[PDB]
Amino acid sequence: FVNQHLCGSHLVEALYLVCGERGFF
């Protein structure tokens, strides 16, 4: 986890690592 802002493109890493395997959007 992180406690910062993920201003689109970083989300995608914090998104890859969270929902990567299931995909997201």
Added chain:
Amino acid sequence: GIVEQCCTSICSLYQLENYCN
């Protein structure tokens, strides 16, 4: 929405889960 949730504040580990599921 998706890129406001966490760039317009920090957001949480569930709030950041709610992209997939």
